[model samples]
Target: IKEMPQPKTFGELKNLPLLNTDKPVQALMKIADELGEIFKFEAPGRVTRYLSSQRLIKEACDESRFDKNLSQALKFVRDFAGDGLFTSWTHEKNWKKAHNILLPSFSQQAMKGYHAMMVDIAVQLVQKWERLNADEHIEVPEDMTRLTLDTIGLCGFNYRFNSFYRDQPHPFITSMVRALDEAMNKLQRANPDDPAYDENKRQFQEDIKVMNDLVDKIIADRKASGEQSDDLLTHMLNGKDPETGEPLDDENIRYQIITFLIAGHEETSGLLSFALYFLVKNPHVLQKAAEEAARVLVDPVPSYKQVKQLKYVGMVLNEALRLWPTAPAFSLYAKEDTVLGGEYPLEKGDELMVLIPQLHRDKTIWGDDVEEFRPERFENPSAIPQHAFKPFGNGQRACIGQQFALHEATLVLGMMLKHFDFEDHTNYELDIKETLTLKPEGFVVKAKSKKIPL
Candidate 1:
């Protein structure tokens, strides 16, 4: 901390907040390129470091010595998520309990159970597009949002968002959109005096109650109904913490449901959105992806085993994540007093924000054409450098939804590539929309139905 590069203070009064704070990832990237990968900022209450080089981040990924720290944004999220898995205190029992209990839901066999439901919503999306006029420009991110949100609802909980059928997102989603906006916006100033603070506070609390009531209704129906559904909700309601054999009480279950909705939707939707955008931008890559989807999706709807065989399409998804990981940065801190990358010393309280886009484009690892959407870089999964790619967070704290997200992405991308020919009707530039996650803002493509019909 004593000998690290810090971004210059133009006036020394506002030195901390101005550097890429608005679009945090890119703001930091511009600084990293100028000041070098490992730079320090001396803000009140903490000395935070941002690391981009794979070499430094790989070492930091060692969980025994370094672990996740809640960024201020995530800390603000704590009021909403409580001790839920994503926002739990690092040492809480529920994270481990819920982690172990929910394990059964995402297993390969469980994915097989989810496959039909996954297919159900995917076809809903394809059908929506199939019925679209040739002149209609499909807003890629918007539709991906609708598709992914519904898929998570139906497959994970036997709940239907009916997003494709409705013009507005389900009321639960609408409440969430409002709640999340205030949650992120409130971080700028932690004061009672900020304008609209009183009104926004009034709305956010009601927003949480609306979500809680909805989740509670879902739980109540499952518990009381004579149903034997095979989905995440039922598994959780009946599950026990293996060590103590204690079932998740209803309150924690409520926490987990919202966490899943928050965790599940943005990243997967953005990944699909960005993947489609990249595919349309790169035709040769699109051709190979289309080739894989065609071969794998022989059935009208793909099965568990068929979606598993979509190797090239899977690579394209990875390539998109590498370029624009929806949840772009992860914050970690040293476990104790230690030296970083063999030189710089750090203490337990010091924070490290692992910048993914910078590491993903590290020229030494990916070569000079790092900016291009080249899926072949992932042709050999065994060959990718350890800790170099972390669209999901690293170590045990990594996202539990990886398998589910990949399966869904592969299914949708594989199916759509097989079903339609996409035209980049707008020739849109890559402008990212970032909140908790990142998406290609306002990206739209036109789809022509390629399904051979009677």
Candidate 2:
């Protein structure tokens, strides 16, 4: 057979030798603009494919007749993390059961209750910022991460990380962070037998053990208390499989808790950072957002209903989610033979990634000013297509905690804007570090309390 020609451009990347890059995510960012909609390349696996077109992504996400499964890499990662709902391989059974059980916990009414706790945590975060010197540059991403961690710790499991109060991050938080980093390292490393691979594997195992131990302790504490607050953890503890009427064992319950810790905080934290990044970069938008926040956030403690009413703030968040989605790429598997995007054929077990950043910025879908940060673009509901804006995801598999994340971030950002004025103090432009999530690196800001008019 004649050797396949090397790809001259990203559009021609399919079925060729893998495009080798030290930074795979960064490479995609460079070429995705020029690569049209869909492209395929091998990265960390043979024949890994990508789809940036809204039409294709919509078909993959919205249709249920076509059974889509998580990719093998995600399964491996989830197995390492204890096979939670987001990472579950047995979609037909485990995912269904878990989803059914957890769905009610994230509903609007339930979220209202979580809102009070979220506000309490946000107040603590604000208090922390208030104590900082005016000229001191805050590591905004890490601080946002700490806030989200504390928020999730309390809301999800009725436990507290005390992230804002602590001088150092909680030990469990440290271990979880290290474990996720090592898991990414283990997945991306080409050589399995390398010494570093073994070391990472060992560290990941140890870190995971620590995380599991923490979950065990939380569960044990709850069981011993015999007190039921009707929170998320209580729901999980009392939840039984609808079909079999069997409760989750300690191991499976721990898996779900750990999953919440990992998935629950990371993207929301990244969103908060990126939202601030864009807000600082676009002063007009920031001013408008702050004005809207000030008007709606008149109450010292904003309600979930009140936060939802901040349309402009919501627009800013949606725009930030489009520009720098934390989970930039996600895979959907073909259940059986089918044609995608009215052309490309996919067979059972074939995996394709929805390249989110690429799709979100597709000039074809988002117009020529796609690169620009304009929150007003989201003001009109009918302006965009169904699957065009999928920061949370699409269809049934969409994030159950989507509202949860949004409410928490919005309230936090709104509350911050109402209380403080933030100035970008970063020495550089937005540079992203993509692993499991797209993380903002070296993003700093100076924040000071705003003096309101009497």
Candidate 3:
């Protein structure tokens, strides 16, 4: 038997058997220019084929039935919550479905409540910022995560499960976040083809079940009591698609609710982590965001109407996401064998994991100094590709919670900037140390009250 020669060109690379193990997008970004342009990182088990064509990915998203996958993930959320049982748990399937459902909420009326929640936290954050900014050393990552968690709980569910306002997390809620953190850690550690993948996945499923069951019980109890509110939970309790005349099934509803809880808070917290990291490191960007907030936000905080006008804030946030997408990669398991981006052939079992960070910061797409933080890069905007800046993901399966997230971020950052001036007097170096999202390792900062308005 003869061994095959190694690939020498783009075409030759595509023709070779490729498998994608989940390599960190940051690593891929470092040498994306080489490695066949679309290098296959890791190994045969997960076969992450890095696709540089944003347009193609978006096209796949538009035509894909990613909902079934999302639905299954939602089922796990529902059963875990309602029955507190793991009768039928499937993470891969449910995650995709939940994503689809949750994404739409951003554009709907649901975002209004999301906006309000962020505003409330932002105001509170501003007060904290004002009082704390005078101090030279103050650690705030825990506080920031708390604020984000509270906003997610309040807006995602009608319940006032306030971690920000409360001294301690609700017992069950604390357990849930803890479980999520552990499971997420495991998933990140194990490759899709790892020998222990199933066992590790089972453990992750059980953890989700514990959290889901608790929430399901609460939902049932809330419904029985006839309590009504605007959070997605209430909508789930009593909502139906107008045209379809079909209410969300328990699985779909539960999936939306729980993922909303998880994805909503986690993504924002990551953003907060990344935002602080970026804002502190790039004083110019931070100052501009602060200055913009000072000019736009009023006493009550930026209202729902005003959120759209704060474009600079949006740009800053977008730029942060670009550098560090929350879900490091967006993947799709193929349905039919197909040719992608000219030569890359995808088989049914072979998955496509787009190395998001690499594509996002690609010099070809994002220009030179793609690594640098320049809010003005978004000023011309066209300098970047439409799908290149996929922080919340791209295509139909792109994060439904994106609007909710942006609104929350804008409100928090805006109001906080209005009252306090943040300076990295400590000169803390930014650290990235989370899998699901790029979390700042020591995410610390100082908040100072501005003598003059912003």
Candidate 4:
């Protein structure tokens, strides 16, 4: 730990090894490897540390008791997000306001509507896979990405990228992905004047414009059509602030939609991809999952209500999340000077980053088999303490779309298992690519339809 470089200024900290292009998590892991659970560092006007205890994380994110502001690392992301809820350094008041307005859109009733759309898109993906030659390997990440993008486009915004139908991805998807990459890197450029940042910064700005303009066009087109649907975009337009009695402005609404699209698309797709990897690796588990699907989902397709009864499906997804949470880490700043876990003292400006991967696998909490892919661990979920397995985070700041993502993923996995079996003929070793989320870089699998094989 002492060998690590101590960065004293914002400029210095931003350029630390944690922000390295490749294996940034490894750099962070080096510190955690040596420091044990919690270690504090002194930065210019700030105290920062990597926190791995579930208790501390829960305390830090409890906005009801604490101030629960985002950490400084998210400032650049805030700039990227504009006025969106995911924007860095958003005041609690504004976050709550936007969160309240968007909450109902993901409710049970709303998700049922989204569920139908998800199945339709998933069927298209299955058909696309059916068309592939048996010798051809299906690229999980690429296909999942396209499927998720189209799903979010149609469900969230009532727009269609028709990604699977097109040979080339939409220009918007290309630009948005590029923008996310550049923004993540550039945001860590402590030296805004640094020459290396200029080009990336320029590209980031352009990409932001592309996304913003696209959202604006969609909003305008929806308004002109004079036809309102039950999608999130319509919710954004119709939702009014309770306090101000004013509807969110067009720009603010645009930010919210973009935030949902980006967050929802990447995380769900990454989870689905990783879940497939696990199912293929563990055949017995896959068999159990298939059996569950057969017994509960007799139609080979799950309804919204049937998904809730999918105990095995939920367990599998939870296990996958435990291994590879889409958002590996999340940060929260100290609302006031406080003692965390009744031991570590944090000042008001101190920053705590909850390392979900470490926290989830902590030997003390999860026992010795933490490394194993055992969905049975989640069979009796109440046995695990609160905040111990927070793939969706904790407290009020927890993911609003947690149920939505879970339902969608469970239904799709159940359907896939019902009709087909997957095998990783290549026996590909896991090589995780960490960008805005953690995803397999280019993993592929072979599928055999139950009815026939070419």
Candidate 5:
């Protein structure tokens, strides 16, 4: 009679979902199929208490019960990010510095400015695809990356990766990819005695220097230019800590810039990729989106003012993220030994993995069509419930660049619809590629610049 209520524990079979799929969220999804909404599974370094139902997930969102935790996935990312906003400890000092400096930097007028720059990057992407013959197939994920990466560079910093200018990625990106790969995979290489370890060690340090020095160059060059711009780089260059009257040091500034570029590009690119994939598969939806695009894009290209008119494309983004969130889960730690959902038991030190992909598909809220791609589900604000769909995540530790990423992806999608008609060159099935984020692999389409079929 005195026993506390505990959630279902997926002990032995938990590893099966993990073993069967390389994508971590798919593993969690498979595990959810075995166990219901709430469950726990303990691994070596990762002790996970996953919540899938929207109600329980919302219950855990209370700050008094839970706060952000540094994930096992991002443990080594701190070595790369160094108290940067996304990688900071819950109470870390520099996290506040990033928030302090950045909050004021993002003004409505400033974002309007960013939209102008976003259109420029969008033009580059559309034009690049325009140059491709109808016979040539376009790689969706990589192409989407090009749009956001170049946009982040031009808008965040005054720097330009000029990704479209070269047939290959910029040399800086080459180094970034290697360094990030090394960071993400270090835990999987068994012991340091492995044969590949020594070469990887050497390569990792080399790649680190390439990016570190590159960041240093970007900062020094900005100061030496003797001009100030409205970009975040300029804000960081000139910003002071609002509370403490202190300014961010040069090294701290470096990490913030790195954090913005990497997090921004990976997330937004995946958003656009998945959205485009959905539209092409559902021709009726594509036809509707293209009609919206044609009605609004009165100029040769989409203007910043016309962006808000993309109501249907905005719905497309909402639905796309509902189906596939690139940043699949957010890590949370309990504030105290407490009862969750007024039913399940929790401990002070336990880590809660908010299973977002499952939460978005909660049957109680989304009903029978949870698996289908229906953007009209988002057309009315009242029909959608709060905390049910947080594709960008939730709480103070949620994404800072939500506006930038969402705005850029929506604008780019509209531009694509206005200019090109997408077709499946090869009858493709949905095969997910999991990098630091999720994307569709070998996903290609013939983008016809001919008039969109109305």
Candidate 6:
């Protein structure tokens, strides 16, 4: 506290070593070693009162649902993972419950539908890209973002967002991007100790409200349709629980739908944007990805099976997530005293901040040139230890939608590459900003299509 030049305000707390991002990786590693565990600051005044912030205890362990109350658990989060819809439910219960109900819906059938939608959107993108490449060589990152968002609406929700087709920006898409941006900025700015922390909390609340409203309408419409969809919502409402025979109620159904919408889409979009960023810089790698995609997905439209065979495209996507993770930070509040990795000690209520960026770049785990983009490292999965590489996160909390994200991204990239070649633009400078996830500051890129060789 004495190190901070300014005192009495929350802004000063943002500069502290625990809450600050400006601290060097070496210093962060030192703290990790010194504490002998991942120590996170306790809430506000509690830090001064406690021996160590890690001593704080949480009310519950992971999502615990009994057979009798399973419906209640599913409803809270399914209504909206971002903001659980019911008046009585807590956000904590809702988010976790929604994820529980969501995992099963990542079925082969849903994966196929998502892949088909992705291929359709990528086809349209390549058509426009071909013309744009010939007429003028401009940025393509924003276009790709639009494509991904559009794909999410069609594939994830079966709604027509049409962000790519519209001449002007869509309000929902624009607001979502801005909302995520603001939420991340607020997280970094408002320290747990700040008196005005409540105000920052209000901003996230407001964001959740907007997202909830949009998702609620979509869910309500899906319920009224009386039609089945390949999307997860249909599966969730109708599918029986493995342990219990009951199907999800309307509120629980909605919560699961919204969770899938956010987790399933946003993370994948960030990843696709990152991949295009690298392709613009390294034309050779771009050629390799395009060649692989072309040779594998030569049909009029790419299929899910073709998506699996594009080894080079798969490697490129793998490398992008490694370098620019959608969620660069992971926070977990300890429920009870536990040991992580058999090295990091923990106590109840201690927030475990796993510095993913630091781990990804660790020389000991990766190599001397760990920071460099080398997709070949992935040729042998056994090369890197199991938990060391996790763009989706590690252990139980790992992304359930990971396979879905990969299928969609692979199909989209493969289909587009079959028609157009991405031309390098913007000199390949990475302008990344860490917010809710690792996203390009402006999500910008430049590219052109390649003519088919005679």
Best by lDDT: 1
Residue 360 in candidate 2, Cα distance off native in Å? 0.6
Spell out the clash pairs found in candidate 5: none
Clash pairs for candidate 4 = 78-88
Tens-digit lDDT track for model 2 on 1-454? Answer: 1121122433333322223443556566665556656666554335545777787777888555354466644665675456577777545566777777888888877888888788878888787778887568788888898888888888888887887767677989788878776655555445568785677777778887888888998899998987787468898888987876777777777888887787655888899999999999999999999999999988767878899888888899899999988877777777777777777776676777778888898777899999899999999967878789888876777778888888888899999889888887655587786656777788988887885421
Model 3: per-residue lDDT, tens digit, 290-347?
8887777754556787777678888888888888876666655566666665556666
What is every candidate's alpha-carbon RMSD to the true fold?
Answer: 1.8, 3.4, 6.1, 3.2, 3.1, 7.1
By TM-score, the best candidate is 1
lDDT of 6 by residue, 257-278 (tens): 5555555446676787787777
Each prediction's whole-model lDDT (CA): 0.84, 0.76, 0.60, 0.77, 0.80, 0.57
In terms of TM-score, how similar is model 2 to the real structure? 0.92
List TM-scores for all candidates, in order.
0.96, 0.92, 0.79, 0.92, 0.92, 0.76
Error of 1 at 36 (Å): 1.7
Task: Give per-residue CA lDDT, model 4, range 135-240, as digits (tens).
Answer: 8878998888877777778888888888897877688877778877775675344466878777877888888888888989999998888788857888888888
Q: Ranking by lDDT, best first?
A: 1, 5, 4, 2, 3, 6
> Model 4, poorest ten-residue lDDT window?
1-10
lDDT score for candidate 3 against the true structure: 0.60
Give the distance in Å from residue 427's predicted Cα in candidate 4 to where it truly belongs. Answer: 0.9
- Residue 453 CA error for candidate 3 (Å)? 10
lDDT of 1 by residue, 1-454 (tens): 3478888764543345643355767777788888876888665455678898999999999999998888877887776777788887567888789888987787766788888999999988888888987568798888999989888888778998888888878899988878877777765553447675888888989998899899999889888895878678888888898887988888888888788888667889999999999999999999999988888788877899999999999999999999998888889988898999887898776789998888898887889999988999999999998988999989888988889999999999998999999898778998987778888888989988887431
**How well does model 5 score by local distance difference test?**
0.80
What is candidate 5's lDDT per residue for 1-454, written digit by digit as tens?
1233233344644332343335657877777766778777654445677888989888788877788988766776666667788888768888887788887666445678787788788888887887886468898988888888888888888788888787788877887777777776664433546886888878877876787788888898988986888678888888898787788888888888888778756778899999999998999999999999889977876676788788999999989999999888888888898888778777897888888889988999999889999999988968888789888777887888877777788789998999888898688899887666788888889988865332
TM-score pick, better of 2 and 6: 2
TM-score of 6: 0.76
